[PDB]
Amino acid sequence: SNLIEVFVDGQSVMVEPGTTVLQACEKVGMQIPRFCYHERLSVAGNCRMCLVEIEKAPKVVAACAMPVMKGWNILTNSEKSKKAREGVMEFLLANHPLDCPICDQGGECDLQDQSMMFGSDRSRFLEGKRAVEDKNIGPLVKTIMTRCIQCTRCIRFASEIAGVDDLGTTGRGNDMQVGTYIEKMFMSELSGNIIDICPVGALTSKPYAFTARPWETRKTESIDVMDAVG
Amino acid sequence: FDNSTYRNLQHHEYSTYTFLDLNVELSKFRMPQPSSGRQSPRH
Amino acid sequence: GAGGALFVHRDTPENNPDTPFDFTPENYKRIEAIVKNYPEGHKAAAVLPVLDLAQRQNGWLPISAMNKVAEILQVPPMRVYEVATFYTMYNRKPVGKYHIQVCTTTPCMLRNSDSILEAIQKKLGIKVGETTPDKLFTLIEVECLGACVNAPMVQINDNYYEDLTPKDIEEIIDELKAGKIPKPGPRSGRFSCEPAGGLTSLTEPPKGPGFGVQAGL
Amino acid sequence: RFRGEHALRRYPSGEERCIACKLCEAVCPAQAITIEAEPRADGSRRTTRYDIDMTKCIY
Amino acid sequence: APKKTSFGSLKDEDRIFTNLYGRHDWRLKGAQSRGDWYKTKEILLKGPDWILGEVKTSGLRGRGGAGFPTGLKWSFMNKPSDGRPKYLVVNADEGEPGTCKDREIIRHDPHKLVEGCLVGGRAMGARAAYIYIRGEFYNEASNLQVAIREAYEAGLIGKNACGSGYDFDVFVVRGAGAYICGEETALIESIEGKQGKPRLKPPFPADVGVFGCPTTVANVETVAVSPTICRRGGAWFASFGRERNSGTKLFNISGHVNHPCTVEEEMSVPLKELIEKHAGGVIGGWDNLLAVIPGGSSTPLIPKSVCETVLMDFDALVQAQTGLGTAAVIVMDRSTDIVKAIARLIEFYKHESCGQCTPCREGVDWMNKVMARFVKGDARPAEIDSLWEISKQIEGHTICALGDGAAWPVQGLIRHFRPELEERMQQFALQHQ
Ligand SMILES: NC(=O)C1=CN([C@@H]2O[C@H](COP(=O)(O)OP(=O)(O)OC[C@H]3O[C@@H](n4cnc5c(N)ncnc54)[C@H](O)[C@@H]3O)[C@@H](O)[C@H]2O)C=CC1
Numbered sequence: 001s002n003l004i005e006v007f008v009d010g011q012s013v014m015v016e017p018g019t020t021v022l023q024a025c026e027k028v029g030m031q032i033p034r035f036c037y038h039e040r041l042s043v044a045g046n047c048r049m050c051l052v053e054i055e056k057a058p059k060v061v062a063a064c065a066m067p068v069m070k071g072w073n074i075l076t077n078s079e080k081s082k083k084a085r086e087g088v089m090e091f092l093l094a095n096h097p098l099d100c101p102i103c104d105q106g107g108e109c110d111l112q113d114q115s116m117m118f119g120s121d122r123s124r125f126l127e128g129k130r131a132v133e134d135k136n137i138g139p140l141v142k143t144i145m146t147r148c149i150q151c152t153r154c155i156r157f158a159s160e161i162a163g164v165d166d167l168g169t170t171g172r173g174n175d176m177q178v179g180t181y182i183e184k185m186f187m188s189e190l191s192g193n194i195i196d197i198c199p200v201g202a203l204t205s206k207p208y209a210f211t212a213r214p215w216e217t218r219k220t221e222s223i224d225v226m227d228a229v230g
Numbered sequence: 231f232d233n234s235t236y237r238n239l240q241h242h243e244y245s246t247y248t249f250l251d252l253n254v255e256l257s258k259f260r261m262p263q264p265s266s267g268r269q270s271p272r273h
Numbered sequence: 274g275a276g277g278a279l280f281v282h283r284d285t286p287e288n289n290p291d292t293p294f295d296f297t298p299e300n301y302k303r304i305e306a307i308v309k310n311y312p313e314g315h316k317a318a319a320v321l322p323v324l325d326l327a328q329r330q331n332g333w334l335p336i337s338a339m340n341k342v343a344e345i346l347q348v349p350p351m352r353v354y355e356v357a358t359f360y361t362m363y364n365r366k367p368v369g370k371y372h373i374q375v376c377t378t379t380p381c382m383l384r385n386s387d388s389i390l391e392a393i394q395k396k397l398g399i400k401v402g403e404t405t406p407d408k409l410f411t412l413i414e415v416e417c418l419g420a421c422v423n424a425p426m427v428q429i430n431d432n433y434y435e436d437l438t439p440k441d442i443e444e445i446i447d448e449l450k451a452g453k454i455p456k457p458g459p460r461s462g463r464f465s466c467e468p469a470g471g472l473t474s475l476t477e478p479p480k481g482p483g484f485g486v487q488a489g490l
Numbered sequence: 491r492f493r494g495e496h497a498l499r500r501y502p503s504g505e506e507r508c509i510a511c512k513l514c515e516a517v518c519p520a521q522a523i524t525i526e527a528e529p530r531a532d533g534s535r536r537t538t539r540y541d542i543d544m545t546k547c548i549y
Numbered sequence: 550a551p552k553k554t555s556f557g558s559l560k561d562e563d564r565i566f567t568n569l570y571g572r573h574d575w576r577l578k579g580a581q582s583r584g585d586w587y588k589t590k591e592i593l594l595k596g597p598d599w600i601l602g603e604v605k606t607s608g609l610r611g612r613g614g615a616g617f618p619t620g621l622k623w624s625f626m627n628k629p630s631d632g633r634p635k636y637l638v639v640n641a642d643e644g645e646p647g648t649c650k651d652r653e654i655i656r657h658d659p660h661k662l663v664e665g666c667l668v669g670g671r672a673m674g675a676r677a678a679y680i681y682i683r684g685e686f687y688n689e690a691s692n693l694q695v696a697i698r699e700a701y702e703a704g705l706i707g708k709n710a711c712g713s714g715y716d717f718d719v720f721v722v723r724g725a726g727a728y729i730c731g732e733e734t735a736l737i738e739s740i741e742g743k744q745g746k747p748r749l750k751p752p753f754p755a756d757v758g759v760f761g762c763p764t765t766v767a768n769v770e771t772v773a774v775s776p777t778i779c780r781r782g783g784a785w786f787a788s789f790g791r792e793r794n795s796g797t798k799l800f801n802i803s804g805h806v807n808h809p810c811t812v813e814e815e816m817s818v819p820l821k822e823l824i825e826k827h828a829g830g831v832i833g834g835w836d837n838l839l840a841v842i843p844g845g846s847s848t849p850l851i852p853k854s855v856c857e858t859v860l861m862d863f864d865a866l867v868q869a870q871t872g873l874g875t876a877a878v879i880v881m882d883r884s885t886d887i888v889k890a891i892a893r894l895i896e897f898y899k900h901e902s903c904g905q906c907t908p909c910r911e912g913v914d915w916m917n918k919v920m921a922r923f924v925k926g927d928a929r930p931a932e933i934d935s936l937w938e939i940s941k942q943i944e945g946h947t948i949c950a951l952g953d954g955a956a957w958p959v960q961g962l963i964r965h966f967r968p969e970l971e972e973r974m975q976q977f978a979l980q981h982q
Pocket residue numbers: 611612613614615617622625642643644645648731733753754766768845847874875949950
């Protein structure tokens with residue numbers, strides 16, 4: 001009907017209008033790297049890890065926020081895309097703390113895995129790192145803000161899914177921080193989901209702290225009985 | 231006619247509220263604003 | 274370099290939610306006029322001018338002022354906190370009666386702005402982050418004020434004092450602390466962005482309404 | 491470089507070095523290390539169980 | 550003799566901003582004396598298509614700094630209405646170091662800007678105009694409000710502006726100290742009560758802009774020349790400058806010159822002629838010239854060897870690898886620490902980044918630290934290539950163009966003064982063992 005044709009690495013894909021580059025790529029089983037894009041949240045475009053090269057276009061596009069156009073040839077594995085990924089990962093890791101052995105995210109970290117899969121293997125950062133002070137947002141979610149990569153996933157979830165506008169950013173540039181700007185507990189019936197959505201160890205479960213590693217656990221799939229939602 | 235003097239001397243008599251006083255004065259010259267059909271995006 | 278100001282608020286006896294703040298009736302009328310400048314469904318657009326008005330009435334912005342603005346505009350307080358922390362013209366701490374801001378950007382810096390900075394520091398006895406113990410002068414460094422042609426330039430209480438030499442800023446400080454209002458602008462007999470001598474352009478008289486209007490109009 | 495009987499070490503202040511990252515447990519080819527951990531009374535990340543089966547260890 | 554090949558001397562009758570130095574009354578009376586607000590009704594009754602055609606044939610390019618063709622940009626907003634209102638947003642942030650033109654335009658003859666707002670709104674079919682003036686420009690904003698009040702009382706704007714039967718309002722909105730708010734999308738976000746963070750494109754402001762309505766963001770200098778272009782026609786304006794570099798321009802010359810000033814001159818004027826004519830020449834003679842930044846901090850610096858014949862337009866300066874930008878000339882003589890000036894510019898950009906996107910937020914601070922170390926000389930020569938690669942990574946990978954404006958100055962410095970950095974590192978190494 002109104003489907004248009006686009007090419008992902010020379011393979012023709014028929015997609016609905018308004019489909020983004022990331023969605024067109026995943027129509028053929030290719031997952032684009034991401035940090036700020038969540039499919040159940042508003043598009044942000046801030047991380048810049050999803051940049052890919054469109055054929056015959058000098059500038060890379062953000063796959064998470066750019067609608068595909070007819071006749072486009074995405075190139076998910078070209079030199080420009082790989083170099084963009086490496087540069088973005090380098091910038092992400094420049095100020096990140098050497099916290100992996102004490103971080104609860106270790107072993108199931110998107111930053112770690114995507115550094116291993118799309119970044120470089122060494123550093124050329126020769127300065128001192130930043131360090132921000134910690135926040136208290138209740139007895140459920142542990143906060144270690146130095147690990148924050150400024151994805152803004154928690155703010156969007158709080159505003160759109162939980163309906164609570166207590167989370168935001170203060171300051172600008174390097175100094176910008178995520179929090180409440182005052183001592184206020186982010187208390188909600190869905191508050192614990194910000195731990196899952198946060199890709200790093202910035203937000204973690206406080207009852208779970210230091211007790212296990214992901215490769216140790218055995219996974220059992222079952223149903224919740226604490227209400228009638230199931 | 232002459233290019234002798236400077237004509238921007240008045241701004242020397244500007245106080246803290248001059249801009250907002252001018253806005254208040256101009257509020258009676260505007261046209262009715264359009265409306266989005268709501269009171270807020272959260273209504 | 275480093276900012277020096279924190280972006281986390283901790284409650285203080287001088288700055289807490291129960292600190293007294295309220296707009297005067299005249300300021301309430303001004304707020305009404307400000308709000309009536311935007312479409313009816315978008316009243317959050319008035320956050321910036323109303324916050325600035327609260328600062329102009331109070332001198333700075335306590336957390337109570339931010340909460341008051343958020344309540345007046347029916348906006349969540351976190352958005353007002355975001356706006357107050359993002360923009361550098363907002364004072365989340367008390368300042369002096371005169372806020373002396375000196376541009377240290379390259380165009381200003383090339384024409385000896387360090388002389389102006391050191392003259393102010395020597396005349397007041399405070400550094401670029403401190404306040405006079407009389408609590409009437411405050412000195413900071415700002416980026417570019419848009420008046421690069423006149424350098425070095427200093428802005429005090431929303432007034433520009435341009436073409437400065439150390440003596441010029443010294444006498445400006447003297448007559449400011451003497452209860453007088455120094456003349457804003459340059460201090461080299463130039464009073465504009467004109468060349469310092471000669472008036473190399475716009476010497477012929479300007480012409481009238483229909484000088485070169487095209488035909489068929 | 492000789493490899494002998496195992497030991498756990500301290501910092502010069504007397505605080506333990508081990509932080510319960512479980513990298514040694516993960517890498518051990520004989521599955522000879524068993525570890526449990528929880529936040530200490532002062533909030534430190536420390537172990538409550540650190541067992542090495544020396545009849546499983548290949549040294 | 551058609552197709553002029555030597556430019557750089559236009560007399561007063563061909564100048565637009567005849568009250569640039571504020572020597573005549575800026576109150577409506579002076580504007581009418583100078584031809585301001587003349588025959589605006591007839592132009593308004595010519596329709597939007599005629600105004601768009603005049604702007605197109607005049608070849609005018611955006612004076613904000615990007616040089617985008619104004620006619621196509623203003624015709625982007627020429628669609629049938631779908632219910633949402635349409636707006637014109639005039640940019641008056643003026644955050645680029647070295648730039649002072651918009652300040653003078655606003656303070657000394659604001660009626661030109663008001664009438665430009667009217668004619669642009671008519672052309673774009675915009676309901677009202679929002680003028681986002683820099684917060685530090687309190688007096689300029691007050692003068693603009695006084696001119697707006699005079700226009701409202703005189704019937705030039707508002708209900709039935711002139712006799713055209715067209716309704717149009719002008720509003721002045723002040724920022725609070727943020728250079729990033731000059732970017733069009735960040736400016737729109739700042740108008741709507743949010744942080745001045747740019748939004749991605751697409752969508753463009755012509756489709757989803759201020760309040761989600763179709764809008765166009767235009768520099769105040771671009772807006773203020775449209776009425777005179779309509780009055781004198783597209784051809785008169787298109788005669789000046791080279792092909793695709795038409796018109797005249799305001800120039801700011803600051804730095805190490807005897808008489809820094811702001812003048813109006815034809816576009817393609819050579820840099821040397823402008824400097825030695827309007828600025829009184831470089832301090833200590835032309836042989837004392839070290840480098841010149843042609844178009845503000847975001848444009849790469851060029852050495853003295855290039856300022857002997859280079860022209861002041863978009864194309865020639867692009868071929869010189871330096872760009873025209875906002876036509877803000879910063880002059881640095883041979884007594885200038887060239888590393889210190891670029892480091893100060895990078896510190897400015899580090900203090901002005903909005904923090905939204907990873908490349909700017911992290912790499913600009915990284916470059917600032919590296920340049921601060923370069924000034925002393927602690928680094929090694931390999932760090933020069935490292936810094937080049939860092940700038941390359943930042944450029945083209947950011948949401949907005951502030952990453953470009955941070956990366957380009959260090960690229961120019963490394964391109965043209967690498968021996969200075971190398972010898973400074975050598976001196977530091979030999980001094981500190
Ligand atoms: N006036 C001042 O003080 C300052 C000026 N600048 C200058 O701003 C320049 C970069 O500005 P940008 O807006 O980021 O460049 P840009 O090329 O992306 O945009 C320029 C104009 O063209 C429009 N445009 C571009 N492509 C379009 C398209 N495909 N469809 C519809 N409209 C389109 C844009 O809406 C915009 O208004 C810099 O080179 C800098 O020199 C920077 C800082 C301050």
